[PDB]
Amino acid sequence: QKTPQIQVYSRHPPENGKPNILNCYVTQFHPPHIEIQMLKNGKKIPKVEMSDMSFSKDWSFYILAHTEFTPTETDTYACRVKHASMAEPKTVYWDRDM
Amino acid sequence: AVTQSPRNKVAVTGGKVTLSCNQTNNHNNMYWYRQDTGHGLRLIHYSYGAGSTEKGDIPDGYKASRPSQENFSLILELATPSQTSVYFCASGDAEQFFGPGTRLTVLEDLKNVFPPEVAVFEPSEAEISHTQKATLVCLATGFYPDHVELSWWVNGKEVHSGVCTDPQPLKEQPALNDSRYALSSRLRVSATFWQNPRNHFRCQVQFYGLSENDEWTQDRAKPVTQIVSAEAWGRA
Amino acid sequence: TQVEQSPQSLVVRQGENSVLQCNYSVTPDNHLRWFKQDTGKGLVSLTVLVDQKDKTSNGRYSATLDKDAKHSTLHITATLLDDTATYICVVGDRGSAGRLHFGAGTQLIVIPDIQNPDPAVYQLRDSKSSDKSVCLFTDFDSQTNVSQSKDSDVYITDKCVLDMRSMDFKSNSAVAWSNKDFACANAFNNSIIPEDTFFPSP
Amino acid sequence: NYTFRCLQMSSFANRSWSRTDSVVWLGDLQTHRWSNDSATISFTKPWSQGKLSNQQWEKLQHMFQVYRVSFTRDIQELVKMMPKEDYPIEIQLSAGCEMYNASESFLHVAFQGKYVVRFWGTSWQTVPGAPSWLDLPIKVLNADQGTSATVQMLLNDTCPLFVRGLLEAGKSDLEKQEKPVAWLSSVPSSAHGHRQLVCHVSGFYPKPVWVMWMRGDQEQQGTHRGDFLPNDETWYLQATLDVEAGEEAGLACRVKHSSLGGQDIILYWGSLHHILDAQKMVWNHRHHHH
Ligand SMILES: CCCCC/C=C/C/C=C/CCCCCCCCCC(=O)N[C@@H](COC1O[C@H](CO)[C@@H](O)[C@H](O)[C@H]1O)[C@H](O)[C@H](O)CCCCCCCCCCCCCC
Ligand SMILES: *[C@@H]1O[C@H](CO)[C@@H](O)[C@H](O)[C@H]1NC(C)=O
């Protein structure tokens, strides 16, 4: 049971009030079965298209989740991951600077 | 070779029946099968090796066990009338090699089991005077269930030449279910053979019934497994 | 049913050809074994066919296979009497230690060719009590069928063949007896009896 | 040269429950999808069929269609052979071949995350370091020559007759050039009195890109390449630089890429453009990363 890393980034430069595409990239995890959510302010963002799950040269799986979103100064975006290797779900927030 | 014991068995509803199977071909895979008319063999349990048991396609009512590689047993915990069939045991390393097959009859009431009455009928002079051959007829009748093997015997040796035996027994009452059966057999020798006084004939019917470990109450004789024989002699 | 055999029962005149069929809808299909079951005995492997389109021979038995139709056929040329058995077609789904698939089989009955028929019905008597007797219908050609009794008290067996090995002689025979006034002249009265049948006064 | 990878993941939960999904990559482009829910292998590109005719394809799809079931049903029997091994189990197959007219085909199998079995020569093989309880399963599987044959067919001869077809087919898609877009930001370093200067690069294709922070002609040696991140089918990358607060000025993120054609994206920290953009993206800073 290997613990999943999570990375959240945008497809274009973030500009407040202009529609972008948010990426959530869950990797280096095992076994494959996993549950991923995108969240705008806590409430689960409905439209989340997933890539086909795969695996790297180290045999650990990875999956790309993405949704269309509008970035603002106040609204908060996060990726919530439920996996067997963690007791509590892992909630990682979008940090446009990092 | 593959060997099964017992070969035939009469069991009571709710009784504990066990069918042992054996092979010395040093195999690893062992299979149990059931044969019923208009079906083809179906798998009950199977074993990939020692200390292993795996449910097949029809496993309800059966338990398999394997204590050794050489032997593989099948247990019917509570025997049912619905499990009356012929059971086979196979083996492989795939080339499946099969055993002789066990006839298990499972009955509701053991108070319906009867041995056969055997009677050899002697050749008609008219047949002797028209063909220069004689036919002896044997008739084993009034017996249930149908578990018999009729053999002919000459002077102490068992004959194969000249013998015909019924494909399947005749039910004495077709308008019933639990009816008793009947079976015929024929030995045709030459006329000069039958006309010899020193020649001895003997029908031999081997019937498979209650085993002496089964309780019996009825005021008649206990219908055990026995060999019933009828005998005739040549005439000058 | 996963695997089907045709016909149910084939009947042949001794010393002729006999074709048996097998159709399966099993995937994947590694091989196909034909078995031979002597009535009241185990199964004996006649031949095996592994290739996509296969042909094989063993004794008088010669089998074919075409997986482009998932179909098999067993030929026995010049059939003997001792061939009267059930032949079962068995498909193997994997070429490793897989589960076999069994057809319902084909019962093969071989009638003996009788050159000189001598249709006769003798009356035989018991060794112990002359009161008890039977009727033996014997030496008939294989065109004759033995029907059952329409009467609840007359017991008639179906025909059964015997070979006298030293004599090279083969003959049919059926037996009748009645608990009840029952003549051997009029016992097989429900069958088609020949004209030239021998009916000896008793 | 392009590495063609067939990736299959099969999860067995218990006696009853089991599922199998597969993906197909040429270079780093997904061409085929196959779901446990789905009956036929899905194309993901308008050229994924390659230089194969419908007949050549339907026969191959059927070949795998039979395999999927057969594989599932085989494993769960191999488990029955072994109290030795127990549920739940994770099977991972990694097939394919790299094209160089020379090719090296491979078929690697991984058990619970560890790679233990491969195909080699004319049979299956345990590896160095593999456990010995995988021996009897191999001896059982190596008994089937019929499968061992059909595998060799695909590995020795079919894969390259197929792959060389794909390369020739999707030449226009595989050669597609994309412009990277770039922007800057900063975060407090894990150190006291320091600042990390994120430089973002997004939306380019192909993969190989060159990013270095610069003081004019001098390449900044503390430039740290990120890991490439996926977007559709484009690429995201960031290049950090740790600076002592007060040295921000005079620096530049320089991006070299084949699709520019000798005219690089150059981002000066503290130019009117940097000032103008970094304003367009302000926010309350909760919840930032600790
Ligand atoms: C080229 C374009 C690719 C696009 C399609 C991509 C698909 C994604 C899948 C990728 C994985 C590919 C792997 C496929 C393996 C090829 C095997 C084909 C043969 C097969 O299915 N053979 C079947 C059919 O059975 C038969 O019927 C066959 C009739 O064709 C005959 O060949 C045989 O005689 C007969 O047996 C057999 O059942 C076979 O045994 C299946 C097992 C395959 C082995 C997998 C390896 C597992 C490692 C186990 C070790 C771990 C131990 C722990 C348990
Ligand atoms: C996976 O596929 C098999 C066969 O297609 C199916 O029986 C099974 O239900 C599937 N597993 C799931 C949905 O978890």
Short mmCIF file of all heavy atoms in Angstrom, two decimals, chain B residues 119-161, unseen atoms left out:
data_model
loop_
_atom_site.label_atom_id
_atom_site.label_comp_id
_atom_site.label_asym_id
_atom_site.label_seq_id
_atom_site.Cartn_x
_atom_site.Cartn_y
_atom_site.Cartn_z
N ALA B 119 -34.03 -69.25 -11.47
CA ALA B 119 -34.52 -70.53 -11.99
C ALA B 119 -34.03 -70.83 -13.41
O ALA B 119 -34.35 -70.08 -14.33
CB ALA B 119 -36.04 -70.56 -11.95
N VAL B 120 -33.26 -71.90 -13.58
CA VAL B 120 -32.77 -72.28 -14.91
C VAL B 120 -33.80 -73.14 -15.63
O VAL B 120 -34.26 -74.16 -15.09
CB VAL B 120 -31.41 -73.03 -14.87
CG1 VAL B 120 -31.10 -73.69 -16.21
CG2 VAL B 120 -30.29 -72.09 -14.49
N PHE B 121 -34.17 -72.73 -16.83
CA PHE B 121 -35.09 -73.49 -17.67
C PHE B 121 -34.30 -74.34 -18.66
O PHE B 121 -33.34 -73.86 -19.26
CB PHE B 121 -36.05 -72.55 -18.38
CG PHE B 121 -36.95 -71.80 -17.44
CD1 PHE B 121 -36.44 -70.80 -16.63
CD2 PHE B 121 -38.30 -72.09 -17.38
CE1 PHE B 121 -37.27 -70.12 -15.76
CE2 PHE B 121 -39.13 -71.41 -16.51
CZ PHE B 121 -38.61 -70.42 -15.70
N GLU B 122 -34.71 -75.59 -18.82
CA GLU B 122 -33.97 -76.56 -19.62
C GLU B 122 -34.44 -76.59 -21.08
O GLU B 122 -35.60 -76.27 -21.35
CB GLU B 122 -34.05 -77.96 -18.99
CG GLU B 122 -33.23 -78.12 -17.71
CD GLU B 122 -33.25 -79.53 -17.15
OE1 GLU B 122 -34.07 -80.36 -17.61
OE2 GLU B 122 -32.44 -79.82 -16.23
N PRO B 123 -33.54 -76.97 -22.01
CA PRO B 123 -33.81 -76.96 -23.45
C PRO B 123 -34.96 -77.87 -23.86
O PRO B 123 -35.15 -78.93 -23.26
CB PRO B 123 -32.52 -77.50 -24.06
CG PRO B 123 -31.49 -77.31 -23.02
CD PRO B 123 -32.19 -77.47 -21.72
N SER B 124 -35.71 -77.44 -24.87
CA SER B 124 -36.80 -78.25 -25.39
C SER B 124 -36.25 -79.26 -26.38
O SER B 124 -35.40 -78.94 -27.21
CB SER B 124 -37.82 -77.37 -26.09
OG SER B 124 -37.25 -76.72 -27.20
N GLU B 125 -36.74 -80.50 -26.29
CA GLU B 125 -36.34 -81.55 -27.21
C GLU B 125 -36.55 -81.12 -28.67
O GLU B 125 -35.70 -81.38 -29.52
CB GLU B 125 -37.09 -82.86 -26.92
N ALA B 126 -37.67 -80.44 -28.93
CA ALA B 126 -37.96 -79.89 -30.26
C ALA B 126 -36.83 -79.01 -30.82
O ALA B 126 -36.51 -79.09 -32.00
CB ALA B 126 -39.26 -79.14 -30.24
N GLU B 127 -36.23 -78.18 -29.98
CA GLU B 127 -35.07 -77.38 -30.38
C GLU B 127 -33.85 -78.26 -30.68
O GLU B 127 -33.12 -78.02 -31.64
CB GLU B 127 -34.73 -76.32 -29.32
CG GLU B 127 -33.63 -75.33 -29.74
CD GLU B 127 -33.09 -74.52 -28.57
OE1 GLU B 127 -33.89 -73.97 -27.79
OE2 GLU B 127 -31.84 -74.41 -28.44
N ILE B 128 -33.66 -79.29 -29.86
CA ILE B 128 -32.53 -80.20 -30.04
C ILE B 128 -32.69 -81.00 -31.33
O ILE B 128 -31.72 -81.31 -32.02
CB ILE B 128 -32.36 -81.11 -28.81
CG1 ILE B 128 -32.17 -80.26 -27.55
CG2 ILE B 128 -31.17 -82.03 -28.98
CD1 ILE B 128 -32.56 -80.92 -26.26
N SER B 129 -33.94 -81.30 -31.68
CA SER B 129 -34.25 -82.12 -32.85
C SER B 129 -34.44 -81.31 -34.13
O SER B 129 -34.87 -81.86 -35.14
CB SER B 129 -35.50 -82.96 -32.57
OG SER B 129 -35.26 -83.89 -31.53
N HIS B 130 -34.12 -80.02 -34.09
CA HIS B 130 -34.32 -79.16 -35.26
C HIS B 130 -33.10 -78.32 -35.64
O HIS B 130 -33.00 -77.84 -36.78
CB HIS B 130 -35.57 -78.28 -35.05
CG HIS B 130 -35.79 -77.27 -36.14
ND1 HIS B 130 -35.74 -77.60 -37.48
CD2 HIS B 130 -36.09 -75.95 -36.08
CE1 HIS B 130 -35.98 -76.52 -38.20
NE2 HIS B 130 -36.20 -75.50 -37.38
N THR B 131 -32.17 -78.15 -34.70
CA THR B 131 -31.03 -77.26 -34.89
C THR B 131 -29.69 -77.90 -34.58
O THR B 131 -28.65 -77.45 -35.07
CB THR B 131 -31.16 -76.00 -34.02
OG1 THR B 131 -31.36 -76.38 -32.66
CG2 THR B 131 -32.32 -75.13 -34.50
N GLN B 132 -29.72 -78.94 -33.76
CA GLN B 132 -28.51 -79.56 -33.21
C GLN B 132 -27.78 -78.57 -32.29
O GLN B 132 -26.55 -78.51 -32.27
CB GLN B 132 -27.58 -80.11 -34.31
CG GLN B 132 -28.30 -80.90 -35.40
CD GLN B 132 -29.31 -81.89 -34.83
OE1 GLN B 132 -28.94 -82.83 -34.13
NE2 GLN B 132 -30.59 -81.67 -35.15
N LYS B 133 -28.58 -77.81 -31.55
CA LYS B 133 -28.11 -76.87 -30.53
C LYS B 133 -29.16 -76.79 -29.42
O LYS B 133 -30.35 -76.99 -29.67
CB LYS B 133 -27.89 -75.47 -31.12
CG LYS B 133 -26.75 -75.36 -32.12
CD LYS B 133 -26.59 -73.95 -32.67
CE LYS B 133 -27.80 -73.50 -33.49
NZ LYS B 133 -28.02 -74.33 -34.71
N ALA B 134 -28.71 -76.51 -28.20
CA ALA B 134 -29.60 -76.39 -27.05
C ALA B 134 -29.46 -75.01 -26.41
O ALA B 134 -28.35 -74.49 -26.30
CB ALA B 134 -29.31 -77.48 -26.04
N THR B 135 -30.58 -74.43 -26.00
CA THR B 135 -30.55 -73.13 -25.32
C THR B 135 -31.03 -73.29 -23.89
O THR B 135 -32.07 -73.89 -23.64
CB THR B 135 -31.46 -72.10 -26.02
OG1 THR B 135 -31.24 -72.12 -27.44
CG2 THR B 135 -31.19 -70.69 -25.48
N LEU B 136 -30.25 -72.76 -22.95
CA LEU B 136 -30.67 -72.70 -21.56
C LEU B 136 -31.03 -71.27 -21.20
O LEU B 136 -30.28 -70.33 -21.50
CB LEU B 136 -29.59 -73.19 -20.62
CG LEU B 136 -29.27 -74.67 -20.70
CD1 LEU B 136 -27.92 -74.85 -21.34
CD2 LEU B 136 -29.29 -75.24 -19.30
N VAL B 137 -32.17 -71.12 -20.54
CA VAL B 137 -32.67 -69.81 -20.16
C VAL B 137 -32.58 -69.68 -18.66
O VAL B 137 -32.85 -70.63 -17.93
CB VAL B 137 -34.13 -69.59 -20.67
CG1 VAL B 137 -34.77 -68.38 -20.03
CG2 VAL B 137 -34.14 -69.44 -22.17
N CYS B 138 -32.15 -68.51 -18.20
CA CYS B 138 -32.12 -68.21 -16.78
C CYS B 138 -33.02 -67.02 -16.51
O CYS B 138 -33.07 -66.07 -17.29
CB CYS B 138 -30.70 -67.91 -16.31
SG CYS B 138 -30.61 -67.79 -14.53
N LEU B 139 -33.73 -67.07 -15.39
CA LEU B 139 -34.66 -66.01 -15.05
C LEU B 139 -34.52 -65.63 -13.58
O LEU B 139 -34.85 -66.42 -12.69
CB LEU B 139 -36.08 -66.46 -15.36
CG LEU B 139 -36.93 -65.51 -16.20
CD1 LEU B 139 -36.52 -65.59 -17.66
CD2 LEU B 139 -38.39 -65.85 -16.04
N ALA B 140 -34.00 -64.43 -13.34
CA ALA B 140 -33.87 -63.89 -11.99
C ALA B 140 -34.95 -62.84 -11.82
O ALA B 140 -34.92 -61.80 -12.50
CB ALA B 140 -32.49 -63.29 -11.78
N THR B 141 -35.92 -63.11 -10.95
CA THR B 141 -37.12 -62.26 -10.86
C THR B 141 -37.47 -61.81 -9.45
O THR B 141 -36.96 -62.35 -8.46
CB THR B 141 -38.36 -62.97 -11.46
OG1 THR B 141 -38.71 -64.08 -10.64
CG2 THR B 141 -38.10 -63.43 -12.89
N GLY B 142 -38.35 -60.82 -9.37
CA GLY B 142 -38.86 -60.30 -8.10
C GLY B 142 -37.76 -59.75 -7.22
O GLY B 142 -37.55 -60.25 -6.12
N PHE B 143 -37.07 -58.72 -7.70
CA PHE B 143 -35.95 -58.13 -6.99
C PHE B 143 -35.90 -56.62 -7.18
O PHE B 143 -36.21 -56.10 -8.25
CB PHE B 143 -34.63 -58.78 -7.42
CG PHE B 143 -34.15 -58.36 -8.80
CD1 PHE B 143 -32.99 -57.61 -8.94
CD2 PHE B 143 -34.84 -58.75 -9.94
CE1 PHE B 143 -32.54 -57.23 -10.20
CE2 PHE B 143 -34.38 -58.37 -11.20
CZ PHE B 143 -33.23 -57.61 -11.33
N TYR B 144 -35.50 -55.93 -6.11
CA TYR B 144 -35.42 -54.47 -6.07
C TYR B 144 -34.38 -54.08 -5.01
O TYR B 144 -34.36 -54.68 -3.94
CB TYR B 144 -36.78 -53.88 -5.72
CG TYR B 144 -36.86 -52.37 -5.73
CD1 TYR B 144 -37.00 -51.67 -6.93
CD2 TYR B 144 -36.83 -51.64 -4.54
CE1 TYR B 144 -37.08 -50.28 -6.95
CE2 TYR B 144 -36.92 -50.25 -4.54
CZ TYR B 144 -37.04 -49.57 -5.75
OH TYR B 144 -37.13 -48.20 -5.76
N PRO B 145 -33.51 -53.10 -5.32
CA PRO B 145 -33.40 -52.35 -6.57
C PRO B 145 -32.69 -53.16 -7.66
O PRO B 145 -32.34 -54.32 -7.42
CB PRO B 145 -32.56 -51.15 -6.16
CG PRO B 145 -31.65 -51.71 -5.13
CD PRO B 145 -32.44 -52.74 -4.38
N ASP B 146 -32.49 -52.56 -8.83
CA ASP B 146 -31.81 -53.27 -9.92
C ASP B 146 -30.29 -53.16 -9.85
O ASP B 146 -29.68 -52.23 -10.37
CB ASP B 146 -32.37 -52.86 -11.30
CG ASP B 146 -32.39 -51.36 -11.51
OD1 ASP B 146 -32.73 -50.62 -10.56
OD2 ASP B 146 -32.07 -50.92 -12.64
N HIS B 147 -29.71 -54.15 -9.17
CA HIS B 147 -28.27 -54.22 -8.89
C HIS B 147 -27.82 -55.68 -9.01
O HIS B 147 -27.48 -56.31 -8.00
CB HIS B 147 -27.99 -53.72 -7.46
CG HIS B 147 -27.79 -52.24 -7.37
ND1 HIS B 147 -26.55 -51.67 -7.15
CD2 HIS B 147 -28.67 -51.21 -7.46
CE1 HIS B 147 -26.68 -50.35 -7.11
NE2 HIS B 147 -27.95 -50.05 -7.30
N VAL B 148 -27.82 -56.21 -10.23
CA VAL B 148 -27.46 -57.61 -10.47
C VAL B 148 -26.48 -57.82 -11.61
O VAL B 148 -26.43 -57.03 -12.55
CB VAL B 148 -28.70 -58.51 -10.71
CG1 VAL B 148 -29.49 -58.70 -9.42
CG2 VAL B 148 -29.57 -57.94 -11.82
N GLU B 149 -25.69 -58.89 -11.51
CA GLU B 149 -24.74 -59.30 -12.54
C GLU B 149 -24.82 -60.80 -12.72
O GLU B 149 -24.26 -61.56 -11.92
CB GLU B 149 -23.32 -58.87 -12.17
N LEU B 150 -25.51 -61.23 -13.77
CA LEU B 150 -25.76 -62.65 -14.02
C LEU B 150 -24.63 -63.29 -14.85
O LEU B 150 -24.33 -62.84 -15.96
CB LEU B 150 -27.12 -62.83 -14.71
CG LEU B 150 -27.64 -64.23 -15.04
N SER B 151 -24.01 -64.33 -14.29
CA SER B 151 -22.98 -65.09 -15.02
C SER B 151 -23.33 -66.58 -15.13
O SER B 151 -23.95 -67.15 -14.23
CB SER B 151 -21.60 -64.90 -14.38
OG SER B 151 -21.52 -65.45 -13.08
N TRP B 152 -22.92 -67.19 -16.24
CA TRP B 152 -23.10 -68.63 -16.46
C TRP B 152 -21.86 -69.41 -16.03
O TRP B 152 -20.74 -68.91 -16.08
CB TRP B 152 -23.38 -68.92 -17.92
CG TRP B 152 -24.76 -68.56 -18.34
CD1 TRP B 152 -25.16 -67.40 -18.93
CD2 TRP B 152 -25.93 -69.37 -18.19
NE1 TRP B 152 -26.51 -67.44 -19.17
CE2 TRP B 152 -27.01 -68.63 -18.72
CE3 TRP B 152 -26.18 -70.64 -17.67
CZ2 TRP B 152 -28.32 -69.13 -18.74
CZ3 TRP B 152 -27.48 -71.13 -17.69
CH2 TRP B 152 -28.53 -70.37 -18.22
N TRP B 153 -22.09 -70.66 -15.61
CA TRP B 153 -21.02 -71.50 -15.08
C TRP B 153 -21.13 -72.94 -15.56
O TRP B 153 -22.18 -73.57 -15.43
CB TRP B 153 -21.00 -71.43 -13.55
CG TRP B 153 -20.56 -70.08 -13.02
CD1 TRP B 153 -21.32 -68.95 -12.90
CD2 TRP B 153 -19.25 -69.73 -12.56
NE1 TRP B 153 -20.57 -67.92 -12.39
CE2 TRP B 153 -19.29 -68.37 -12.17
CE3 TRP B 153 -18.04 -70.43 -12.43
CZ2 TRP B 153 -18.17 -67.70 -11.67
CZ3 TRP B 153 -16.93 -69.76 -11.93
CH2 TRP B 153 -17.01 -68.41 -11.55
N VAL B 154 -20.04 -73.44 -16.14
CA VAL B 154 -19.97 -74.82 -16.62
C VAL B 154 -18.94 -75.64 -15.82
O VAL B 154 -17.73 -75.37 -15.88
CB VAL B 154 -19.64 -74.87 -18.13
CG1 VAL B 154 -19.36 -76.30 -18.57
CG2 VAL B 154 -20.78 -74.28 -18.94
N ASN B 155 -19.44 -76.62 -15.07
CA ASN B 155 -18.61 -77.56 -14.32
C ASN B 155 -17.69 -76.94 -13.26
O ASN B 155 -16.93 -77.65 -12.59
CB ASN B 155 -17.79 -78.44 -15.27
CG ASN B 155 -18.64 -79.47 -16.00
OD1 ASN B 155 -19.33 -80.29 -15.38
ND2 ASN B 155 -18.58 -79.46 -17.33
N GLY B 156 -17.76 -75.62 -13.10
CA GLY B 156 -16.90 -74.91 -12.16
C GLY B 156 -16.14 -73.76 -12.79
O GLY B 156 -15.44 -73.02 -12.10
N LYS B 157 -16.28 -73.62 -14.11
CA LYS B 157 -15.67 -72.52 -14.86
C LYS B 157 -16.75 -71.65 -15.47
O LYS B 157 -17.82 -72.14 -15.81
CB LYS B 157 -14.74 -73.05 -15.96
CG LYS B 157 -13.38 -73.52 -15.46
N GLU B 158 -16.47 -70.35 -15.59
CA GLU B 158 -17.45 -69.39 -16.09
C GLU B 158 -17.35 -69.20 -17.61
O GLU B 158 -16.30 -68.79 -18.12
CB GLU B 158 -17.26 -68.04 -15.38
CG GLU B 158 -18.38 -67.03 -15.64
CD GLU B 158 -17.99 -65.61 -15.26
OE1 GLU B 158 -17.19 -65.44 -14.31
OE2 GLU B 158 -18.50 -64.67 -15.91
N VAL B 159 -18.44 -69.50 -18.31
CA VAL B 159 -18.47 -69.38 -19.78
C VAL B 159 -18.75 -67.97 -20.29
O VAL B 159 -19.58 -67.26 -19.72
CB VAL B 159 -19.48 -70.36 -20.46
CG1 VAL B 159 -18.88 -71.75 -20.59
CG2 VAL B 159 -20.81 -70.40 -19.72
N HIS B 160 -18.06 -67.59 -21.36
CA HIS B 160 -18.32 -66.35 -22.07
C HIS B 160 -18.93 -66.61 -23.45
O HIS B 160 -19.76 -65.84 -23.92
CB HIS B 160 -17.05 -65.51 -22.20
CG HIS B 160 -16.44 -65.09 -20.90
ND1 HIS B 160 -17.15 -64.45 -19.91
CD2 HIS B 160 -15.17 -65.21 -20.43
CE1 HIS B 160 -16.35 -64.20 -18.88
NE2 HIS B 160 -15.15 -64.66 -19.18
N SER B 161 -18.53 -67.71 -24.08
CA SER B 161 -19.01 -68.04 -25.41
C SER B 161 -20.43 -68.60 -25.37
O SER B 161 -20.73 -69.52 -24.59
CB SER B 161 -18.07 -69.03 -26.10
OG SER B 161 -18.44 -69.23 -27.45
#
